[PDB]
Design a binder for this molecule. Sequence first.
Ligand code: ZN
Lengths: 433, 74, 48
Amino acid sequence: HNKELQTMLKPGGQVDGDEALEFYAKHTAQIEIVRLDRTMEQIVFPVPSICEFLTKESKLRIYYTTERDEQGSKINDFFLRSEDLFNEMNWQKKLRAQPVLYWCARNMSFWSSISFNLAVLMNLLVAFFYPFKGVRGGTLEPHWSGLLWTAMLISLAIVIALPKPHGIRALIASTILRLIFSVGLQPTLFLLGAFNVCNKIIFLMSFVGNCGTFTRGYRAMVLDVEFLYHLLYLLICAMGLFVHEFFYSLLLFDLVYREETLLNVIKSVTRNGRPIILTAALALILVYLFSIVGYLFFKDDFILEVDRLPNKEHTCETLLMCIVTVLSHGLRSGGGVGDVLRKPSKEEPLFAARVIYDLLFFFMVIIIVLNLIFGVIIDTFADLRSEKQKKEEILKTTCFICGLERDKFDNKTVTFEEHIKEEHNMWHYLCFI
Amino acid sequence: KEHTCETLLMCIVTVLSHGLRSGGGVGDVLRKPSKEEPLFAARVIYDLLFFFMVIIIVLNLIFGVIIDTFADLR
Amino acid sequence: LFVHEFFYSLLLFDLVYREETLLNVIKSVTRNGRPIILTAALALILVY
Ligand SMILES: [Zn+2]
């Protein structure tokens, strides 16, 4: 009401009285509610001291992952997420006392990134030369020591660069390559495996630290799928350290499945999986009918050429199951079944029968069915892109709480961007709860 | 004499990238199982899994990404 | 002009990148390049 009073607590950023004014402005929220008589009134309250103990990553997760129900409102799931956020803030305040556990839980990204990187490098080491018979052999430059000296020069040039601006993995890779030639490769791989397993057993503690599920017991931490996945990763890492080496390749999926875009394209493939499975079943039954037709009428045309392992050049398939195997062999090769069956030679009476048989198989099975599978995949891309742009637009041009659109705030003595940060800020609603 | 073998697990990756082409899959370059060796069904499911999953799903994934980018741009 | 001749072929790209529709289709390819690179890496690990 007092315009003179209003214009001297707000612009207090440029005055010397900063402590009291910006402290009390920072620690004061504002919320609007509706009472029984459907009247809207405004409440000004102090924020709790525990509400500042909330990580902004969880805030972004709550802002993005909340979805609207059939009535078009996000508050119903927001309440449950608010309760979970309250428990998370309680555990964060409890955790902040410990100096070393908070240091481990504060740096999860470093442990995860270095584990991913050195497991990738471990897979690259086991992939290039498996039998571990030497390092001197190579189709590279005239000496392997030349490439080793080049790597040493690269490491020396990277050791005088800027402090961790770029090339941090380059010097480590050069050092690992230089250690590979000085000492035997199996000691180097044992050292790298021990480093990865100690990295994983400290990262598991770092993960269970800030995600404080383990303070309530054992059932909740055991039943968690993410903890089980991390434990499985640790188990197969220890198994690949102790018996043979291919389990690093096994955990390469868990490595490369950490980002979102590769996830999105794959998991679009796994979205409408039931049309894909049913189309595969349709292909199987079409192959079955074509195989029994070939068993009935073209039994002697199924001569195909094979080569025999040393202790005549042709085999026949007459069991109606080997014929299904041959038709699934001919489901590949693009042309169809006519590329594996013997050539009709234009003079046998079953020539036109062979021509229409081959053309029907090729056209109907190959074209229609394989194009059906690919059309299902493409349509799933279209559906995902449409719903993603729809939810992004409704998040960007609509208030989270009020649900009103940007078009209602044309002039109205206010703006939308101050409405959605002062009048209807949802973190003020969480603070009030 | 007219034939070579690849036993290094890197030459095998080279041969599998050689067989990532040719459309049919890896079953067109490997020798024919001749129906009587015990590892016949293992070869059949191996070839079918490689062809179906790798060829169909992955190459159709790349082309689907390209087509979806056309749709977004338009 | 001074050494060998194939650098005319090298500058043929700069020649054909002067219109707009070709640029539109090329960077329809290279707009979402990171899904394509990650799908290629997925193919590489499946081959492995
Ligand atoms: Zn509002």
